[PDB]
Amino acid sequence: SEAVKKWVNKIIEENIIAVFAKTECPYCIKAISILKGYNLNSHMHVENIEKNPDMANIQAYLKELTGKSSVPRIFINKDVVGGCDDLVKENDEGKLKERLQKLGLVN
């Protein structure tokens, strides 16, 4: 149990933009595309947690951290963004750009 948590943590802490996704997931794809549209590829990690023997443990931990077990699950500098709909709200209302500017990721 500790092992799974430590592995998830490492992904979130070693990558400024961390996205947990699954196979053939339209809102995963959309969210990742939005983020790459800010040229964040170099600070981005996408983990497919469906292709993983411990998917349920990972999803349960992501729910403990964020309130939902669904993918996509999106972290920016360890802060919880949430899912694709959360990302879209932040993007449309200017908060996403604000976040990225404070990190030096967008001018």
Ligand SMILES: [Ba+2]
């Ligand atoms: Ba399918």
Ligand SMILES: [Ba+2]
């Ligand atoms: Ba990368």
Ligand SMILES: [Ba+2]
């Ligand atoms: Ba298993």
Ligand SMILES: [Ba+2]
């Ligand atoms: Ba199992």
